[PDB]
């Protein structure tokens, strides 16, 4: 069950720059006193992050796009940030991920939950006793067919509401690479009331969850102390981009500083010489400045269907000693239609990979056609021999094409 | 498990005895990517996962890095830089019964190709034409999950083939699943062939004093040297140096 929250005040959010935050360890192998260059999804230095904060009655938790990597930061005083939700549609139609820190444990659930617009954790405070006890928890309306579940070690927190300036800074990095959801984090005590501190961060790896789901939507849970109050909280959301860093490792195995390779010409020289100190002179720089963000596709402007139905169901189908060559022209080759009703045994492709077959445009295409027995399917290949590839049908050594074979015991063979 | 929603099981804190498996089970295609089958025994693996799905005989080739089809674009895609072994065998007697086994399903139609190791469980209606289906079946509106028709009277292409795909990560992070090789004594300060946690080589070892991180188990001060390693038996931090100094 969920309900709309009243007395909501609308104010435009602020944008501030992150002073060298959001970098993590790319690998778990130990090194020391060396400089390592890496290419991974990283938040670029001095980028706009979203200053979201509470107190009048300032409450905010919008739905943000994921955009292949999210860096999160939070200035914490009295345990307001409790978790996040990730997904695609957030309405139990797609797979969803939920990370929450409830009153005694930490729960990570990958399931098809249905979500309301304003999820919250409600903490209630009593006049008669000074103890703060968790009372309310509304993030999902109901449950469905669950896939992954994880419950941490039980513990207790500081549930009281401290006053004054914030005392902690907890940083997180979420990314999804090769079906793996990698979470990096570190927490540093701070003394600030409304500021993002100027200090380097070394986010250690925490979990590599093997979830492997589509993800494009993100939202942050909050805790509040139909009257209600929001309390004091502030968090920061930024997005990771494909960049190149150079990390300097100290003698203790922890990283010291990271030199961007696409921010400054001095940083460009530091990247192209792979060192943090450069002398005077002229240093030609390798090109790391620009990364394209758009794609354009232009093809011949004809959308007829190719006669694959004539080739693949030919009812009378050619022999092997006198095979048929059919020219295909002025149409489109929709491969997705072919395997709807036909199963191919050996889809061997020479010179062209099957993955990059869709985006190509063919110029001189011909469709050979013959019937062979099951033992001679291997003979239709460049470099094979036998009584089929020597006397009946020989393929060239520099072949470029795809061999498509299937079973036709029901069609091409009859009794007697 | 089915192929649209396959199962991932984590295996940890045990030993992987390969010799038990082929005592009573015969594997059709033991394709291995990145790791040779001969050197599988002396390795000790770190992060393993056992995928599980049933496919027909013609689509066994589709579970491979770089292959395409309706099982490697819409159901289960393997990454390009895969490191592991694909274990498939015939299961016509177990997974197929008379009258058709309709429990197994697969995504016949999908809007876009899957990312590597990504699971899709949604059952939303796919629109074939430009008309909107609006969540109800009609013309050019089909259920995306079609059912297999496994029957014991069909051919080799139309019978189930249980596929278990293992994914490893060799010689990075601490390891929990090792091979069936037996451990021997350690001869330090002498030239000897070592097999520390699957890392084979020849060179002398001494005692080092640097401290590792809790999530780090190996170390290479300079790459292609492999100087640092921890002894699994004693948890003594050491160093790996070449057999003799080169200054002769």
């Amino acid at each position, epitope marked *: 069950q969920c309900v709309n929250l009243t007395t909501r005040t609308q104010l435009p959010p602020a944008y501030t720059n992150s002073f060298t935050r959001g970098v993590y360890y790319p690998d778990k192998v130990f090194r020391s006193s060396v400089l390592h260059s890496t290419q991974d999804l990283f938040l670029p230095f001095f980028s706009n992050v979203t200053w979201f904060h509470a107190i009048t009655k300032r409450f905010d938790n919008p739905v943000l796009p994921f955009n292949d990597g999210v860096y999160f930061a939070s200035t914490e005083k009295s345990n307001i940030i409790r978790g996040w939700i990730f997904g695609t549609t957030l309405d139990s139609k797609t797979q969803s991920l939920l990370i929450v820190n409830n009153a005694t444990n930490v729960v990570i659930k990958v399931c098809e939950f249905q979500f309301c617009n304003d999820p919250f954790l409600g903490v209630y405070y009593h006049k008669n006793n000074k103890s703060w006890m968790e009372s309310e928890f509304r993030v999902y309306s109901s449950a469905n067919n669950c896939t992954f579940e994880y419950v941490s070690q039980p513990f207790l927190m500081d549930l009281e509401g401290k006053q004054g300036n914030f005392k902690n800074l907890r940083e997180f990095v979420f990314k999804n690479i090769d079906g793996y959801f990698k979470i990096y984090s570190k927490h540093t005590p701070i003394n600030l009331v409304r500021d993002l501190p100027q200090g380097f961060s070394a986010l250690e790896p*925490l979990v590599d969850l093997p979830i492997g789901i589509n993800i494009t939507r993100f939202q942050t849970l909050l805790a509040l102390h139909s009257g209600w109050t929001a309390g004091a909280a502030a968090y920061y959301v930024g997005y990771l981009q494909p960049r190149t860093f150079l990390l300097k490792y100290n003698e203790n195995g922890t990283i010291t500083d990271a030199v961007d390779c696409a921010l400054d010409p001095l940083s460009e020289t530091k990247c192209t010489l792979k060192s943090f100190t450069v002398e005077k002179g002229i240093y030609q720089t390798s090109n790391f400045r620009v990364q394209p963000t758009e794609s354009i596709v232009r093809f011949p402007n004809i959308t007829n269907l190719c006669p694959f139905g004539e080739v693949f169901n030919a009812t009378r189908f050619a022999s092997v000693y006198a095979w048929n060559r059919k020219r295909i022209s002025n149409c489109v080759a929709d491969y997705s239609v072919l395997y709807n009703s036909a199963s191919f045994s050996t889809f061997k492709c020479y010179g062209v990979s099957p993955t990059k077959l869709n985006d190509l445009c063919f110029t001189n295409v011909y469709a050979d056609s013959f019937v062979i027995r099951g033992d001679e399917v291997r003979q239709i290949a460049p470099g094979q021999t036998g009584k089929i590839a020597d006397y009946n049908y020989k393929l060239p050594d520099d072949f470029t094409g795809c061999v498509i074979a299937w079973n036709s015991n029901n069609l091409d063979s009859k009794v007697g | 498990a089915s192929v649209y929603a396959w199962n991932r099981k984590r295996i940890s804190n045990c030993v992987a005895d390969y010799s038990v498996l082929y005592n009573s089970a015969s594997f059709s295609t033991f394709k291995c990517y990145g790791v040779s089958p001969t050197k599988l025994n002396d390795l000790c693996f770190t992060n393993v996962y056992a995928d599980s799905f049933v496919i027909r005989g013609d689509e066994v080739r589709q579970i491979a890095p770089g292959q395409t089809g309706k099982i490697a674009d819409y159901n289960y895609k393997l990454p390009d830089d895969f490191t592991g072994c694909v274990i498939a065998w015939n299961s016509n007697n177990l997974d197929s019964k008379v009258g058709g086994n309709y429990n197994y399903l697969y995504r016949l139609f999908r809007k876009s190709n899957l990312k590597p190791f990504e699971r899709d469980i949604s059952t939303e209606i796919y629109q074939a034409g430009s008309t909107p289906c609006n969540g109800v079946e009609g013309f050019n509106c089909y259920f995306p999950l079609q059912s297999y028709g496994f029957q014991p009277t069909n051919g080799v292409g139309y019978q189930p083939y249980r596929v278990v795909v293992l994914s490893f990560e060799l010689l990075h992070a601490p390891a929990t699943v090792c091979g069936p090789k037996k451990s021997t004594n350690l001869v330090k300060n002498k030239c000897v062939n070592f097999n520390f946690n699957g890392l084979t080589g020849t060179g002398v070892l001494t005692e080092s004093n640097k401290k590792f991180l809790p999530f780090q188990q190996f170390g290479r001060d300079i790459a292609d040297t492999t100087d640092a390693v921890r002894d699994p038996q004693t948890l003594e931090i050491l160093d790996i140096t070449p057999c003799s100094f080169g200054g002769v």
Partner: antibody
């Protein structure tokens, strides 16, 4: 070394509340949890509650939930325990023991997934004797 | 809940020998174990934490081992001051439960 002093022996009718106090000395009051152990005469130990002193948050056993109030006084630096509806089987001795795991004034409980938590009752008090009878 | 059973309930030994005591768990506990020693008329003291690690300020004659549902404690060169009650405690989930207790006599 640290010295922990509990309250004296108290006798009362088993139909009212009891007041037990502990006062750890030589250790940061807020860091470690303050575990509570009841021992019956001629019986083994049992765990009844844990106190996160800085938070004031507490966790009871599932058998004794809702009948025991476990509070703190950080101004006078003591841990208080009160039990309602005493029975004849509650005639026992009470120990209040700190737990080994230390913490800071922060929810690094996020790091529960990095480092495993092992709790150990290393330092024990001298105990108090609570005897009730009709 | 989770219950732990120590076997045997009654133990008899001498001074200067090696003795072995064990306790069996119901479900999976992994490495969450506390071995506690309590002298009669005295408060209990922590002896072994995490089932394989010696606690500081304790002599190394005591040792502990075990995994899964089985746990054991080995006593070598048994001093006359070691005649005390032993408990094994599991810390998997709430609530934390103690063992029954083993008594050893001269």
């Amino acid at each position: 070394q640290v010295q922990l002093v509990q309250s004296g022996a108290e006798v009362k009718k088993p139909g009212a509340s009891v007041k037990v106090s502990c006062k750890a000395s030589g250790y940061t009051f807020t860091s470690y949890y303050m575990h509570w152990v009841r021992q019956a005469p001629g019986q083994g130990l049992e765990w009844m509650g844990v106190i996160n002193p800085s938070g004031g948050s507490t966790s009871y056993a599932e058998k004794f939930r809702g009948r025991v109030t476990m509070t703190r006084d950080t101004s006078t630096s003591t841990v208080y325990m009160e039990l309602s509806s005493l029975r004849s089987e509650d005639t026992a001795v009470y120990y209040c023991a700190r737990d080994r795991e230390p913490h800071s004034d922060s929810s690094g409980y996020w790091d529960s997934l990095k480092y495993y938590y092992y709790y150990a009752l290393d330092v024990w008090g001298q105990g108090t004797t609570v005897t009730v009878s009709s | 809940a989770i219950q732990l059973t120590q076997s045997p309930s009654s133990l008899s030994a001498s001074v200067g020998d090696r003795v072995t005591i064990t306790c069996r768990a119901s479900q999976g506990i992994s490495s969450y174990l506390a071995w506690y020693q309590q002298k009669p008329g005295k408060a209990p003291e922590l002896l072994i934490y995490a089932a394989s690690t010696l606690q500081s300020g304790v002599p190394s004659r005591f040792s502990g081992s075990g995994s899964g549902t089985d746990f054991t404690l080995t006593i070598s060169s048994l001093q006359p001051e070691d005649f005390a009650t032993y408990y094994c405690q599991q810390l998997n989930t709430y609530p934390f439960t103690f063992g029954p207790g083993t008594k050893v006599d001269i």
